[PDB]
Amino acid sequence: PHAKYLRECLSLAEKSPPRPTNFRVGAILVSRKEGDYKTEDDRIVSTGYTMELAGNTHAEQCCLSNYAAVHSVPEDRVWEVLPSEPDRKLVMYVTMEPCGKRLSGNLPCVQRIIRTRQGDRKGIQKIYFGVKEPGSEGCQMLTAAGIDWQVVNGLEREILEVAVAGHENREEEVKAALDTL
């Protein structure tokens, strides 16, 4: 089921405008029953893709921002309105490892994820992703804050090719990232 979710994330990423500099990524926020869950019981809470929303926005950021907007709060307050049911957990699928730093200085996605766990709200408890960030790691920052994560293998070339489609060095870029496997 995790690979199926990442393929849906890939479809979202394909809506991203290809830019010579951005990484085209898709993200899906899922509410899942604790225990031996049936995917049929999964609920899609929100979705996002790179630059879906005005400005220099990441997939995970748009995912949270879309939900925030529907609930009449800014994204930095999305933790207040996300579901926090006793029998369910929030997990986020994203094609690429969430960023731990952004060159622009904007708040990194790992921090947007971590800050969903505030007050009595459980927040996002696990991230599934398909490729590590190509090129302090986001995954280490998630661990340090108690956010679980898991790499879902098998889709690396496809995720990377979509992500760097707008780049001029895109063939060398994918080959380098696949070499790190």
Does 62 bind Zn ion (CB under 5 A)? Our answer is no
Does 58 bind Zn ion (CB under 5 A)? Our answer is yes
Q: Name the CA dihedral angle for 18, 137, 141, 161, rounded to a multiple of 10 degrees.
A: 30
3-state secondary structure of 91: strand
Alpha-carbon gap, residue 85 to 160, rounded angstroms? 35
Q: What is the DSSP letter of 18?
A: P
Place of tokens 């995720």: 159
How many positions of this chain bind Zn ion (CB under 5 A)? 3
Does 99 bind Zn ion (CB under 5 A)? Our answer is yes
62 is in an annotated binding site: no
Residue type, position 181, single letter: L
Residue type, position 45, single letter: V
Alpha-carbon gap, residue 57 to 59, rounded angstroms? 7
- Give min distance, CB of 139 to Zn ion, in A: 13
109 is in an annotated binding site: yes
Residue type, position 63, single letter: C
**Binding test (CB under 5 A) with Zn ion, winner from 64, 78, 109, 131:** 109
- Give min distance, CB of 60 to Zn ion, in A: 6
173 is in an annotated binding site: no
- Give min distance, CB of 37 to Zn ion, in A: 27
Per the annotation, binding residues for Zn(2+) are 58, 60, 99, 109
* Site residues, Zn ion (CB under 5 A): 58, 99, 109
